Ligand binder design. Structure first.
Ligand SMILES: O=C(Nc1ccccn1)N1CCN(C(=O)c2ccco2)CC1
Length: 120
C-alpha cells in the first residue's frame, strides 16, 4: 500500500464509525457555552468531531497526523473539563479514545510508509 492519498478516505470512514458510536454523542458538535458557562475559562482550543470532518472535507488537513492531533484534543479537553474521573462524559471519552487509537494506528503507519517509499 504505497498510496500517499489513501489516508483521507480511511479517515472519512473512521469518522463515520465514530458518529455511529453512542459514546461520541457529547463530542459530535461544539460544546454548549450556555450550559457550561465556565468552559472557555478552562479550555483554550475547543474541538469536536463535526469540526474535524469539516476540516477534512475542506482539504485543510495535509496528513493524518494533523487530524489525529485534533481528535486527541477532543479527548484532552474532556479530561481537563471533568469534575471527576468518575464522570459520564469523561468515561465516554475514554472508551471512544481507545476505539479511535485502535483504528488510526494502521492509517498512520501506512501513510508514513508511503511517504518513505516516495523518497526512496
Ligand atoms: O455540551 C457538550 N456537548 C454537547 C453539545 C450539544 C449537545 C450535546 N452535547 N459537552 C459538555 C462538555 N463535555 C465534556 O467533555 C465534559 C466533561 C465533563 C463534563 O462535560 C462534552 C461536550
Amino acid at each position: 500500500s504505497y498510496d500517499i492519498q489513501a489516508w483521507k478516505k480511511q479517515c472519512e470512514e473512521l469518522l463515520n464509525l465514530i458518529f455511529q458510536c453512542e459514546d461520541s454523542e457529547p463530542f459530535r458538535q461544539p460544546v454548549d457555552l450556555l450550559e457550561y458557562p465556565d468552559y472557555r475559562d478552562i479550555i483554550d482550543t475547543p474541538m469536536d468531531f463535526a469540526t474535524v470532518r469539516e476540516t477534512l472535507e475542506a482539504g485543510n488537513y495535509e496528513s493524518p497526523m494533523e487530524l489525529c492531533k485534533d481528535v486527541r484534543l477532543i479527548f484532552s479537553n474532556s479530561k481537563a473539563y471533568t469534575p471527576s474521573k468518575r464522570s459520564r462524559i469523561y468515561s465516554m471519552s475514554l472508551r471512544l479514545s481507545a476505539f479511535f487509537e485502535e483504528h488510526i494506528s494502521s492509517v498512520l503507519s501506512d501513510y508514513k510508509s508511503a511517504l518513505r517509499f516516495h523518497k526512496r
